[PDB]
Symmetry: C2
Subunit: 193 residues, 2 copies
């Protein structure tokens, strides 16, 4: 059931700066990110949230905001990137009053930070898969933490080179859950039960 | 009881542009405007809302937003000024998706538009009382429509010349409901029962 719909609808107008930028990903993809997050809450899919490649942080701020909207104080949002520096993203969470303990930051190269990542389980995994290595590093390390019922979201999936990186990973692991389109740009799938 | 608090809290961060301008009046005065509007809804004080001197319209957008937040479809918000033109304010309501039938516009000089004003009753009357004539025109014409339990809000009350205009009006009508401070700038009073 849709708690604080108005809040989240306004926040998307604001994050996308449609109101006068904090995320390039646009409305349709924030919409997708809302439904996936609301599904894991409603269905009881355990785990934290995590985005690799956050840029200014809008998507991570938004995921945090949905947790705010449904009164979930247990799940953590993981903001993972090299760093548009870290402190700028931090204070981007602040301006929404969401810079708190439900937001943790993993600064550094993915090669270095992800294998030893202090994440136990995920209900949502998100990546702006522009590059081959970034995508594999993210999927290979973090996907195994993705709980059943959890979602993987790939923001630039339909870029052919991103496609191929992704098909390659799904072949490696024998992952066969079917991919669904979002907007001709991004795509996602829900891990099986 | 506080419906959609998160929505309204975010909207104030946005209207005041504390998030990256739509109202100069600031947080404390949007806060005051929230409590007064929530009181008339909770207490059943009938009537529309009306602001004279709106500038970009932020306060009027906000009043409309509180109606959005409490699911009140009956009350109208009156946006009253000469016109930073009218159409700019209109599309300022649009960017929040609140440009609808619960918002009506009274363009023109107060001398011309207010005596023949198509307003029946008010629960909230608001003015940025910078000038003597604007203040009197607003109070004299519209205050008598203010229901019992209704609020009058004067955004620049503590400016000495605004003070005196206002004391003058309250003397004229034998209005004795005591004035309360907001922030050292604005002030308001609640009409008696
Ligand atoms: Mg992208
Ligand atoms: Mg003023």
């Amino acid at each position: 059931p849709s708690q604080n719909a108005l809040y989240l609808d306004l926040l998307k107008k604001v994050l996308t700066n449609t109101i006068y930028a904090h995320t390039m990903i646009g409305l349709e993809r924030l919409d997708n990110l809302q439904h996936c997050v609301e599904a894991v809450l409603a269905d009881g899919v355990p785990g934290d949230f995590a985005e690799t490649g956050v840029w200014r942080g809008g998507a991570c701020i938004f995921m945090r905001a949905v947790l705010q909207a449904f009164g979930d104080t247990g799940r953590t949002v993981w903001v993972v990137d090299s760093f548009v520096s870290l402190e700028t993203v931090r204070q981007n969470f602040a301006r929404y009053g969401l810079l708190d303990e439900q937001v943790r930051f993993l600064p550094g190269w993915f090669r270095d930070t992800l294998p030893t990542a202090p994440i136990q389980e995920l209900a949502v995994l998100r990546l702006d898969g522009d590059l081959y290595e970034s995508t594999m590093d993210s999927l290979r390390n973090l996907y195994p933490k993705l709980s059943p019922g959890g979602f993987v979201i790939i923001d630039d999936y339909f870029l052919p080179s991103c496609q191929d990186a992704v098909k390659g990973f799904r072949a490696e692991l024998g992952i066969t859950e079917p991919i669904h389109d979002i907007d001709g740009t991004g795509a996602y799938w829900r891990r099986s039960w």
